[PDB]
Design a protein around this ligand. Structure first.
Ligand code: HEM
Ligand code: HEM
Ligand SMILES: Cc1cc(N)nc(CCc2c(F)c(F)cc(CCCN(C)C)c2F)c1
Ligand SMILES: Cc1cc(N)nc(CCc2c(F)c(F)cc(CCCN(C)C)c2F)c1
Ligand SMILES: Cc1cc(N)nc(CCc2c(F)c(F)cc(CCCN(C)C)c2F)c1
Ligand SMILES: Cc1cc(N)nc(CCc2c(F)c(F)cc(CCCN(C)C)c2F)c1
Ligand SMILES: [Gd]
Ligand SMILES: [Gd]
Ligand SMILES: [Gd]
Ligand SMILES: [Gd]
Ligand SMILES: [Zn+2]
Lengths: 402, 401
């Protein structure tokens, strides 16, 4: 009664029993599939808590024990007396790892069990928030030997404002609009750049200016904090055999650190809980450097390669893109900054799929996001059927706080 | 009505065509199964009536007394015999719509230009083979390829069906080996075993064109040898890598799918081979580079002097891109029609804009429309799509063995 899932490179077949536990409705119906869309309390808070507690006690191999029975009753009574309830730190750690493990669009999930979870739930001010973030950046960067981490700020609560990081990531490059409708710098960040300026930031004019953080303590206006440049590790981009590539003057930063998603665990919501790992090379070379609405260097590189850019059948776009990705991988390895190419990353996601089939009966996976944006069918994930569903704990999108 | 966004531009459309989705797909609100490869007299009449109504709607003849007479003819036919037969123009319109409705086809900008060969009077496997040979000749057209479909008799209760046991009309032999491996195309090992067990003396080359197994109702399937100059082939050479020709690679001009079932107005055609022209990545990326096909990536990378030790040299991506260059160049040099994935996805974007005005949407399967290399360099990548099943349609069907 469960979905049959085939790998078409090998012929293997598995059945995803985990999808029965799907705690939320997606956008597809038997009459049309919407899987390609980018963006699709009392006895309700309570139902999510019990399910989360069941998961926790299963993970420590104590399902049904007296302590399991007691914590369920204990949470049930803290809800009634207060509305909300508090996670034990061991449950917070487990729940943050689970949100990662559950995230269908992440190809990096082989690593999910080795996340460092920093407990910032006692944080009181924006200044304290900045200190926690700097500690996160320092630990995760680790001089180039990057380590996965998450810092979880206090949960949302009635009677108190939310903690929020206004930036979409901890490290972002400014984007300044030019006369001729072009963006100097990263065009994706034109908006947050406006807000940093309007809140006191002295802007620069480079193509790679690191933005300040806009931090929001409860019921406060957001506060501006400049990142110390010794904290933000960057990589100059160069090509192992095209010496003119270095004269493009391109760079990227080491640490991908998403700061605008909401973390949900057992009914509780943490609207500021930034997390970081390390980059897959296609995110920098193909999306960030090549997209027409980002840095959009593809044709420039093609011309330097002396490719015929007037006819698509030369595959000049395809050739220039591969070489930009080669440059990214070479440059991170040269600078001794962790990076994974899309062949390694997808090979490890296949191992994750095997692991999860044993451990839980399946794995939620969003095929269109797991398959890299270049060379899709040259990777094993392309030939793997996948089932997409929502499990909690989860990372969720949330509205901009402005 | 689902809201559909293009993320490169920011434009929005609403798909109102999906409301008329006849069948049910694999997905539910609790889990999406969109990546899955394979998802009664009153029944026939209701589909027949729906299709007849579609036909007269498209020619602006809804309600007219010709529309009424046709509906009555089907009512009487199905009452008498449990089935009915299509008029010639209905057949042609049904074949075009089935192509137009195919969510996985990126070449649908061409949907209005389709040659339809009516073979519904076919009597034998020998006659079927004659019809197939005419199709290949018309469709190949000295390399100036023309889209075409030939339709054999409808199925019916009782007697067996006309089937083409080959998945395509042109397929290279796959030879299961004395030592485990495969010689030729590994995707055709099953069908190659069946041709041997029906009296084909096999070859031992990597590109041996298979015979066609053709089967008349209840009568058995019989082998048929294809004339060697009916089947056009393109030797693969590279524009600047002179050693590429020494690999002895080739491919055939005509992609001709012979194993799908055509469904029009409740009737079903188990034998209705259709053909178009190749998108280069189909040959260069899937057929030659898939590890379960010819799997040439490493051999090409070694000839390119690339570092195959570690994946972070991107030797796979470089070799694949040059194989696709060689395909495009070799088909262009040989004057055989081919389209590269950039031009095909550009035309599918225009197709999506055409279909929005005409029908209020367009069913499209994102994972099959995005090309297998350089996906995000093509305009379809940043385009949300809605997948749903309209009729008339091409559908899969079980193997005849
Ligand atoms: C450690 C190495 C990691 C790798 C290689 C990796 C890789 C990726 C990639 C390639 C994407 C899709 C981005 C795109 O398509 O443009 C993604 C998304 C995502 N990742 Fe991972 N990631 C890593 C670490 C983490 C960590 C530590 C977390 C959370 C604790 C996480 C959670 C997510 C989530 C929630 C998404 C979806 C983001 C969205 O939809 O906006 N990842 N990841
Ligand atoms: C004329 C130029 C054509 C081009 C460039 C083209 C291209 C393609 C491509 C690239 C695919 C996906 C192949 C794959 O993913 O392996 C496809 C699928 C498909 N096309 Fe077209 N095609 C053309 C003509 C036709 C014609 C003439 C018909 C029918 C009358 C047709 C009907 C279909 C169907 C039913 C599928 C789905 C096959 C499947 O799901 O396995 N196409 N086409
Ligand atoms: C922890 C981590 C490690 C890693 N290697 N990569 C990431 C990338 C996450 C991420 C972005 F950073 C981004 F800018 C854009 C997207 C897609 C769109 C976002 N959403 C609005 C639909 C995205 F998924 C995260
Ligand atoms: C269907 C699909 C599959 C897949 N794998 N990836 C994507 C990424 C698409 C995408 C986003 F998701 C997004 F948040 C933002 C943008 C740019 C917005 C431009 N504008 C703000 C200047 C974008 F193009 C789409
Ligand atoms: C008319 C036409 C023109 C053109 N350019 N390409 C085609 C390709 C159709 C097609 C094949 F022929 C094939 F062998 C294999 C597949 C993959 C799916 C396998 N299917 C059994 C699930 C495929 F999509 C058809
Ligand atoms: C997910 C996805 C997306 C997309 N766009 N294309 C595909 C094509 C994959 C595919 C097939 F569809 C197929 F029918 C047969 C094979 C080989 C099987 C041979 N093996 C059993 C002996 C295959 F690899 C898959
Ligand atoms: Gd104050
Ligand atoms: Gd050089
Ligand atoms: Gd008749
Ligand atoms: Gd040499
Ligand atoms: Zn779906």
């Amino acid at each position: 009664k469960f979905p049959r899932v085939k790998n078409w490179e090998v012929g293997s077949i598995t059945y995803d029993t985990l999808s029965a536990q799907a705690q939320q409705d997606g956008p597809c119906t038997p009459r049309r599939c919407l899987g390609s869309l980018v963006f699709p309390a009392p006895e309700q808070l309570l139902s999510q808590a019990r399910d989360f507690i069941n998961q926790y006690y299963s993970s420590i191999k104590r399902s049904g024990s007296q302590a399991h029975e007691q914590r369920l009753q204990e949470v049930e009574a803290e809800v009634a007396a207060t509305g909300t309830y508090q996670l034990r730190e061991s449950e917070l750690v487990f729940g943050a790892k689970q949100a990662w493990r559950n995230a269908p669009r992440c190809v990096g999930r082989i690593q999910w069990g080795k996340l460092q979870v920093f407990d910032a739930r006692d944080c009181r001010s924006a200044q304290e928030m900045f200190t926690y973030i700097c500690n996160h950046i320092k630990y995760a960067t680790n001089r180039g030997n990057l380590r996965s981490a998450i810092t979880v700020f206090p949960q949302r609560c009635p009677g108190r404002g939310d903690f929020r990081i206004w930036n979409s990531q901890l490290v972002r490059y400014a984007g300044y609009r030019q006369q001729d409708g072009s963006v100097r710098g990263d065009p994706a960040n034109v908006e947050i750049t406006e807000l940093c300026i309007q809140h006191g930031w002295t802007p620069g004019n480079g193509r790679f200016d690191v933005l300040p953080l806009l931090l929001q303590a409860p019921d406060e206006p957001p506060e501006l904090f400049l990142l110390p440049p010794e904290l933000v590790l960057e990589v100059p981009l160069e090509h192992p055999t095209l010496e003119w590539f270095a004269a493009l003057g391109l760079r990227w930063y080491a640490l991908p650190a998403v700061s605008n998603m909401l973390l949900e665990i057992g009914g509780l919501e943490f609207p500021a809980a930034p997390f970081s790992g390390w980059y897959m090379s296609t995110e920098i070379g193909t999306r960030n450097l090549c997209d027409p609405h980002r840095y959009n260097i593809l044709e420039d590189v093609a011309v330097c390669m002396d490719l015929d850019t007037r006819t698509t059948s030369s595959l000049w776009k395809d050739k220039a893109a591969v070489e930009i990705n080669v440059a990214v991988l070479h440059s991170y390895q040269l600078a001794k900054v962790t990076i994974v190419d899309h062949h390694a990353a997808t090979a490890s996601f296949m191992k994750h799929l095997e692991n999860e089939q044993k451990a839980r009966g399946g794995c939620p996976a969003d095929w269109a996001w797991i398959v890299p944006p270049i060379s899709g069918s040259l990777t094993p994930v392309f030939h793997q059927e996948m089932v997409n569903y929502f499990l909690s704990p989860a990372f969720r999108y949330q509205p901009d706080p402005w």
